[PDB]
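Study this protein:
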Amino acid sequence: RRCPSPRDIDNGQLDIGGVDFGSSITYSCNSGYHLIGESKSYCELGSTGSMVWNPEAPICESVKCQSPPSISNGRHNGYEDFYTDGSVVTYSCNSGYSLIGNSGVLCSGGEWSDPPTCQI
């Protein structure tokens, strides 16, 4: 019974909640990454009644967050063109508004947090 040692994934971790004929594994990324495509393997039979595993290892990469959000009457600073889990950027108005909240913006999880505004 059961299927053979399921396949693995780089920069990711499997969630083997069962390896029985008809079970399913849950694929996930390591940390600060983003798994693309599927995320679950299915223990099934091959073509000649053999043992195999359905879609196991999907995609996985480090959350590359480009230029921070595009606020109104303002913009971001940054020195590079891309960012990842652990990047920061300072925001600034254009015409000359008043940076609302904090100019700093954390880059983590393929997104940005703590974005400011620009009011008079």
In short: The radius of gyration is 22 Å. The chain has two domains: 1-62, 63-120. The CA atoms of residues 24 and 51 lie 13 Å apart. The first strand starts at residue 12 and ends at 16.
